[PDB]
């Protein structure tokens, strides 16, 4: 058997103090707890969220928190820093998918939490570097735990739109396969399909078009369709694919 990483004395102390005040909102927001809570947060982010975070150490911390109290586990895992980021945001963004998996396994993450920038961990996953087959299953696990159709505070973009705009075909297939709606329009009326036509992703256009109920007729706020956009972007091959679709 492997000897588990233990919480630092500062962290154990803070967590035991938290356990004893967590159900008392007066105590929790008081001056007397401020140093405790800052220490708690400081330690958790140092251990869980740096690029060089040790996955085993994070997993052992999670177990240690649960053993102290399930309420302590929920509390720490869901801490957001001053950028509004949780450990789930940072671990998705650093492509540290071992840690992403350990966090989902705790079954307490607020996976729909929007950071200050306005994005959820699912949106961040759309742009993350996925190297292995194992990692994509972890990503699809993430998609299944949250709302894949949530809209960013910035322009109302979805994870699907972000994945399309980057040409990440792996990722688009994942989102679609976990229930991402093709027809959602951002704040300006733009669809995923329109994103695909701006960026010239012919393979992604074919994939979106192949989805049941994919609407090529939708117009953005200035009456532009995917077809009208495609022609202006110079993408003849996309335009003929789009034209055949809206006239099938």
């Amino acid at each position: 058997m492997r000897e588990r990483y233990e919480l630092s004395e500062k962290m154990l102390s803070a967590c035991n103090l938290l356990k004893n005040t967590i159900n008392d909102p007066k105590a929790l927001t008081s001056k007397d707890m401020r140093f405790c809570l800052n220490t708690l947060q400081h330690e958790w982010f140092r251990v869980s969220s740096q690029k060089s975070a040790i996955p085993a150490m994070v997993g052992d911390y999670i177990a240690a928190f649960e053993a102290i109290s399930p309420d302590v586990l929920r509390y720490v895992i869901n801490l957001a820093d001053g950028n509004g980021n949780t450990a789930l945001h940072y671990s998705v963004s650093h492509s540290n998918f071992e840690i992403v998996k350990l966090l989902l396994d705790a079954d307490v993450c607020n996976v729909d939490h929007q950071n200050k920038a306005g994005y959820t961990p699912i949106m961040l996953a759309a742009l993350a570097a996925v190297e292995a087959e194992k990692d994509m299953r972890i990503v699809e696990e993430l998609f299944g735990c949250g709302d894949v159709n949530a809209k960013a505070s910035q322009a109302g973009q979805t994870a699907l739109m972000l994945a399309v705009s980057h040409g990440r075909i792996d990722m688009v297939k994942g989102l679609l396969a976990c229930g991402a709606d093709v027809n959602i329009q951002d704040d300006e009326g733009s669809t995923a399909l329109m994103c695909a036509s701006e960026h010239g992703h012919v393979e992604i256009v074919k994939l979106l078009l192949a989805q049941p109920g994919c609407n090529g007729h939708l117009e953005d706020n200035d009456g532009s369709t995917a077809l009208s956009i495609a022609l202006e972007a110079g993408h003849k091959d996309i335009a003929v694919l789009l034209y055949a679709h809206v006239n099938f």
């Binding site: 980021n85 945001h89 963004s93 994005y119 961040l124 742009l127 994103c195 701006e198 960026h199």
Partner: peptide, 15 residues
Amino acid sequence: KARRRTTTQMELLYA
């Protein structure tokens, strides 16, 4: 428009 922008990993993470 947002549909034409290429958003980076860091634009998603930090305001």
